[PDB]
């Protein structure tokens, strides 16, 4: 094993690889979400953009984890990437609900990894998560909750109109 | 026939002239759409602008086809231009539905011309269409589908309010 | 009829639509003229350019009339566009003679419309014509007469040489 | 199926999704290659950089395919992502040999997709591949062949020295 | 054969080499044309320049074909270059007639190569021709036809005068 | 013969034409050398570049000779261009040896032409050679000898490694 590796458990190494799979799976989900909102029969450009930007953010999260794995002397191992949970995503409301579920699963994986780092006394790992992931996730989940509340307020009234207005005046 | 003309069938030449007629007819339709939304009793400025810009795009499409006809040594022939299918265009929803129908007819004419070019082994024609028309049309039709979905979401609720909001927050 | 419409007769409205047809027909004629001078067996680039620029000017004239129709609360109605009077345009002299005939027909239509506006006491219409069309047409017809005189002086001598020289030293 | 979808076969749609999987698998392989060359006991920074930049290029290829899938009205479907073929990559020579094998498999998939597009008369697909993938792949494979020849010339002599020199004077 | 070569037939490879010979032969012809118009007893500087610039364009065409041959893994093979068809080129009219004959032979060779690429399902080759040669040739042939018409118009009248005027007012 | 021609022998005229053939033949050889080093199975980019730049230099030499031929009132005559002496060029060492042989043949042709100019008392010719060719050739041959010595020093040791290092650290 590495000439560089120091205080880096095989348990963290493996969990890191699993987290990479989760983030790339999340990126794939957002790719599918984005392109669904680009369909001529859905056509909510601002929604498409919001998800496509998240696909990039999650890929970037994976890359950051991969770089860290090499910095610590672990070995990146890639697994098959499951396709997204749906082929069609319903309304903006349905899609944002699915996004916040996804982000909470990522968040919980991050927290689990942190707890493992703390159990293994791996402060570099803890700092890495604290510095590049935990706050970003909190911020993102908050934003999603904000959106959900606004989408919900709009679409009790008259649903199509509310969906359009949200896209035009919050997302675009 | 031309000193320049090479691999340019009489069938493509004629189809090009017909496509010019279709694009100018489309430009005329958008001129009528634009000015209908400028009526004091319709008064949706952002809708007027969206259609007036399309009238310009379609005229520009025609000109591009005419320039190409001369570059290949074909002879532009102009025919009468039929007036638009309607004198009044209803709501923003009605108008966008009519626009996407129109654009799909243009798209199908483009695809037909491409197939003719491919049957005649005219790769300059194919490239010309691929480069200046097929993607533009795809993009435009997608945008229209996006708009339609947003208009529809807005105007199940309460129709006038939705029509106003769309114009103000997506189009203007 | 319009919430905006005021002092705008149905007779002017209809004449405006007819003038739009005439200007678009003129634009089509100039498109054909331009591309004829681009043939490898005609090959007078400066002549091609002079006509292609006029096609744009006439389309722009039509658009200006269409915008005005909507500003006054009239309804644009488009008709078939007749093809140009010729498929081949002869010499630069022949082509300029045909252009000045065309421009005089446009001019006379403009004057007729003005007289109708004056009979209907429609000073907005009169001003619109006076401001954006009557002087432009006068200027253009003068320029064409200038060209014709110079073309004619050149091509009594030795015709091909004169045609080349005009293109090179006046048009290009 | 889509309001936008036109001339886009289910066979191409599916092949596109498969190509996305291949490009993301390639990106994963390059992530593993990059981090292997960052190990303290391998320590060839210029090699690490060369592979890490390729991981980004392949992810970007996938994204471009996903964007195109949505533009055509197809539906992105993601599958599990297999881990890379090796956990340790040997020498720079071994690694470059594995890279060129990988790139040739991507190239052949691209060519297969093109042939399918050509069989389905899908010129947008053909152009998309021709414009954004086929030449890039050719260029890349050439570069890899160049590197391989230079690596091989260096490491018949005295292997460690050659590996160092290549990294320092070609890659860094 | 090449480590890079993929979908590149021996028939295209050979035809490419032949096209290189044709373009370099064309460059040589234009070199001779240029210098003939520089003779003290011909002395038409603008004609000399027009041909000398074409010699450069054709050499550049050859180089572009050679670069492409290497990119595809073909092997450039050079053959003897035949001298130009004439040692003296007559008038500007004679010379432009010879130029357009030459350009049409190049054009037909380009079209033949395209057809071969299409028969071999070599879309990189087709795109290469479409993108860097077919339109350039069309444009050039059109320009030559334009010149020929202007030269001919000038020199029915009084030949020396027309030849001078063309050089001074179109070419210089 | 020319209105301009003065003190320019038919012997020099003919030798100039022959030198043009030699320089274009040299340019062709360098085109083949360049593209050989671009093969995926040779892959020495810096070597490819060094030869491709020489192909341009030799074409430029030919053009300079052609311009001079016209300035003196001679008549450019082009002959077939023989293909290069090899289809594959071996190692960088083999290729540089072939290049210096070629350059010495060009140099000797230049010297022969100078001697002919001196025998014919043609000081314009002598100056032309002295000013634009003899020193360039000396400089180039010296550079090649420098390269050869460095290539040879590198590839007694361990040949592949030396070939790579030379390309990376001298050529690239
Ligand atoms: Au910790
Ligand atoms: Au085609
Ligand atoms: Au009036
Ligand atoms: Au195709
Ligand atoms: Au093809
Ligand atoms: Au001398
Ligand atoms: Cl451990
Ligand atoms: Cl799974
Ligand atoms: Cl035909
Ligand atoms: Cl009709
Ligand atoms: Cl009235
Ligand atoms: Cl009519
Ligand atoms: Cl299908
Ligand atoms: Cl697998
Ligand atoms: Cl073959
Ligand atoms: Cl021959
Ligand atoms: Cl002599
Ligand atoms: Cl020989």
UniProtKB/Swiss-Prot annotation, chains A, B, C, D, E, F:
Claim: Isomerase is one of the keywords in the record: no
CDD domains linked to this entry: Ferritin (cd00904)
Keyword presence, Cell membrane: no
InterPro entries: Ferritin, Ferritin-like, Ferritin-like_diiron, Ferritin-like_SF, Ferritin_CS, Ferritin_DPS_dom
Span list, region Catalytic site for iron oxidation: 53-60
Modified residues (N-acetylserine): 1
Extra remark beyond the main annotation: In horse spleen the light chain is the major chain.
PANTHER family on file: FERRITIN, FERRITIN LIGHT CHAIN
Protein name, per record: Ferritin light chain
Source organism of this protein record: Equus caballus
Organism ancestry: Eukaryota, Metazoa, Chordata, Craniata, Vertebrata
Gene: FTL
